[model samples]
Target: MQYKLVINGKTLKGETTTKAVDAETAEKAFKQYANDNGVDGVWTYDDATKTFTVTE
Candidate 1:
């Protein structure tokens, strides 16, 4: 399933249309995206919303 990564509160706009993946993969993918983008926090993927939230 496709997933969007949310840091703090706002959703991150990026190449999610193409790079989006399943929960397991998306968890790691979002982490990488956050790290590369310099976002720091704890994280989790929401199954119902299909979103990855990285809390500050």
Candidate 2:
């Protein structure tokens, strides 16, 4: 993801270089964060994130 959190087709950036360390640890954490914020195609970041839609 490289300093970015991409899900489905959307991208989200971190605040303080917040990233993964032990592979699945932060990965799972961010994964759940995204899920918790919304769903697969939804993300709530610093200010209510972004919402992705499918049109293809």
Candidate 3:
């Protein structure tokens, strides 16, 4: 399954990109992505789409 990471901005346009894996691996992957990018957000999984949406 493919996940997507979306970074929301208040004054600027947000960004979205394709992430890797499903819920089982999303937590680890999301943490890594946040740490690497210096971002803060929460992760939500969509079983129907098998994707993750990280909202800021």
Candidate 4:
């Protein structure tokens, strides 16, 4: 998200949420963003907990 992307030195920290869909759709979009940004590891979310996790 342009509004959430933040710059810090050579790195960035931010959160991104895609169009509301099922838990799987959200996770897929999140991973796509991560991949485009050269991110490593997995993007995980729990529908019950309503939380998403990503590794920088």
Cα lDDT of all candidates, in order? 0.65, 0.43, 0.60, 0.54
Deviation from truth (RMSD, Å), model 1? 3.8
**Can you write out model 1's per-residue Cα lDDT over 1-56, one digit (the tens) per residue?**
66776567344434342155457776777777777877777777667878766765
The parts of candidate 2 lying over 4 Å away from their true place are 1-3, 7-17, 41-56
| Maximum-TM-score candidate | 1
Q: List the residue pairs that clash in candidate 1.
A: none
Q: After superposition, how far is residue 37 of candidate 1 from its true place, in Å?
A: 1.2
Ordered by TM-score, highest first, the candidates read: 1, 4, 3, 2
Residue pairs in steric clash, candidate 3? none
Expressed as tens digits, the lDDT of each residue in 30-52 for candidate 3 is 66866677666666766776655
lDDT of 4 by residue, 1-56 (tens): 21122212126466555565566666666667767877675455555556676654
- Candidate 2, residues 1-56: lDDT per residue as tens digits? 33335454345433322354444465566666665655465443432332222211
What is the clash count for each candidate, in the order shown? Answer: 0, 1, 0, 0
Give TM per candidate: 0.66, 0.37, 0.54, 0.59
Name the TM-score of candidate 2: 0.37
Off by over 4 Å in 1: 9-21
**Segments in model 4 whose C-alpha atoms lie over 4 Å from true places:** 1-10
Ten-residue stretch with the least lDDT total in model 2 = 47-56
